[PDB]
Design a protein around this ligand. Structure first.
Ligand code: HEM
Ligand code: HEM
Ligand SMILES: [C-]#N
Ligand SMILES: [C-]#N
Lengths: 158, 158
């Protein structure tokens, strides 16, 4: 329990920061790719997943890769993520994220469900095996998912 | 009452279409501009407005132009609108719009509230008085707000 200075308290650093801008560009050639991929994977270990997304709605877990009611979330979330990227240390990062915390905080998205996304995201970054991408991204992206994920709070405000 | 072919049944035409792509570009220099402007206006004639948006939440109708919890909706909705623009005759326009129809259809957004947005949008286009912009945009944009607005249905499905 805390009541803090609420900002994404230190967004890595300029030296670490810069990478997630030029890396995002590379991995977001594939708006339907990297994210729909990042998602079919989360759905394979977790059960709890495929039922809490209204439009994927319990119809067929495993069969995926792409088709109709899923190519929609592939982009929907991805241009809006290029909004979080664009607002990296730009004031409206609090108010932006909070309307999104209003979404997830409803259903029952918490600390369990979050460490599905954030380590399957780590695996997506392996398939772009252009040899050993530096350990500063293996700190940095881990440091981002640690401070940007709904600024940690969702149900954390008593 | 109908059960139709549901698509945005004829998105104007290539001849009319083209304009809303090169016009969108001009008017979406100002992501916080044109939309926050398009919105402060809706709020001046309608009462019903300023209370149904969770983040503008009843605190001060008239004072606006910009500040914190409103510069957030200014962009949020605008990159996602460049998604509808980008998907003009691209299959995922049904599934894209429908998750958005799921949002508005909840509260009580209907045919009344819609002809606030769509004629205040007409007025925004006047302030870009670069002399008399052709009557084909004064058909076309009127023809778009007539077929893209949550593909008309929201509460229209019995
Ligand atoms: C960096 C990670 C994530 C971000 C920033 C993100 C982003 C988004 C976005 C943009 C939306 C739409 C919000 C709106 O309605 O305005 C969304 C929807 C959703 N998210 Fe998160 N998401 C993330 C992680 C997760 C995780 C780990 C869960 C875990 C349960 C999750 C579950 C959902 C659900 C249930 C929806 C509803 C889909 C709908 O009907 O539109 N997301 N997310
Ligand atoms: C071309 C016109 C419009 C479009 C495409 C549009 C788009 C959007 C978008 C992108 C959202 C966020 C949906 C989400 O949660 O994922 C939104 C929210 C909302 N819209 Fe619409 N809008 C339009 C017209 C209107 C009108 C005329 C009303 C009338 C009442 C309205 C009221 C709302 C409300 C109540 C919100 C909730 C804001 C929030 O808490 O995020 N909008 N709209
Ligand atoms: C969010 N998915
Ligand atoms: C929608 N505003």
């Amino acid at each position: 329990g805390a009541t803090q200075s609420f900002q994404s308290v230190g967004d890595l650093t300029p030296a670490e920061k810069d990478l997630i801008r030029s890396t995002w560009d590379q991995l977001m050639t594939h708006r339907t790719g990297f994210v729909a991929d990042v998602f079919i994977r989360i759905f394979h270990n977790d059960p709890t997943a495929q039922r809490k997304f209204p439009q994927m709605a319990g119809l067929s877990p495993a069969e995926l890769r792409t088709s109709r009611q899923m190519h929609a979330h592939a982009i929907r979330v991805s241009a809006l993520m290029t909004t979080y990227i664009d607002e990296m240390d730009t004031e409206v990062l609090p108010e932006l994220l909070a309307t999104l915390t209003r979404t997830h905080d409803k259903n029952h998205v918490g600390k369990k469900n979050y460490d599905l996304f954030g380590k399957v995201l780590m695996e997506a970054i392996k398939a772009e095996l252009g040899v050993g991408f530096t350990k500063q991204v293996h700190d940095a992206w881990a440091k981002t998912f640690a401070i940007v994920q709904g600024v940690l709070i969702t149900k954390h405000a008593s």
